Amino acid sequence: IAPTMMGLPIVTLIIMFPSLLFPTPKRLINNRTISIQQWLIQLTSKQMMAIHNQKGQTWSLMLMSLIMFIGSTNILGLLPHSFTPTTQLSMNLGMAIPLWSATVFTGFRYKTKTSLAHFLPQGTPALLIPMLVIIETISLFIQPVALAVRLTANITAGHLLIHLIGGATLALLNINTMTAFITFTILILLTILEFAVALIQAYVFTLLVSLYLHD
Amino acid sequence: IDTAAKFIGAGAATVGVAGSGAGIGTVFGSLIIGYARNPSLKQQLFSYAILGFALSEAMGLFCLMVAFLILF
Amino acid sequence: LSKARIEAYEKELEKMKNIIPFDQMTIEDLNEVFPETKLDKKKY
Amino acid sequence: FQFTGIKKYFNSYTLTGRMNCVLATYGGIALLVLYFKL
């Protein structure tokens, strides 16, 4: 009967915190703790730049920062009392709309006629053309909200499940075997909750696919 | 009445997670036939299987979040 | 002319050999024998 | 003087990236609608 609370403290200090977790030394040889960060950055950058292979690869140097930021913010939430900034819908809403708008306006800046012609899937039955067009434009307008929700909802749900099962364990003053089993379930869930990085990958990869489709 | 609505709405909403269970079952099953046809388990065969499991689990937990909101 | 060029090349080789110092150098310092390029260069 | 570090990237990708004005307009309209509810 404990009310879940994703409270709103002074956001700026919490949000800026993951940035300080990555130092950038100006040395030929790094500090064997930024080195792993650099290697991960290169490994992910290769995967992200493989698909584009265009002049839009300039966007990749910002998408790397995007994926690093989202991953750092979401991975830090697994701590006992950490407040996930991505739990709040505000910042993810403020991230999904501008980037989708950037993708569509970049598409409309160069080869604009063909960018709008991407609605045409090279012909398709003419009898159902208006239905297909309205479906695809409604999907395109859905895409930003979809991108925001597919991050916010499950990021909140992980913490919600952790809180629920933890409260169940704490309230379980009964047979200790059941308590131990529920604690094992908790640890298994938290190991699964570490897959929030896969959510970062999904978000950034969907954004990359949209940008590549429109550019 | 309102508490009864909370209970019935939660009981309904939690039934929507069954489709995500079917999806994770389907993808993890397809994992095994992909492995059988091509013994490259450590590769994208298992990487994208994990990706699909995470995506469907997201589709299920993002559903049960509504039930959690209804209950509280 | 070739002897002058050879003297220049020998001086450059000696400078490269001496300037190696410690492997823990600076990123900008490594540009002496290995610099980067302008924008739109690192395709991969 | 951190502006010059990413000044080229700023106007390089914000030609369409700096459309956060749309986000600000949407947020302001939503806040006005909620204040009408409020």
């Binding site: 140097l61 920062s65 | - | 990123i27 | 947020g27």
Partner: peptide, 29 residues
């Protein structure tokens, strides 16, 4: 609990984006 308001949460993220991209621009392969 439920997200409301949406004023300053969506404002600090742009500054953090600036900071993160400036930081990672120094990173190189």
């Amino acid at each position: 609990d439920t997200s409301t308001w949406f004023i300053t949460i969506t404002s600090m993220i742009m500054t953090l984006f600036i900071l993160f991209q400036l930081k990672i621009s120094n990173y190189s392969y």
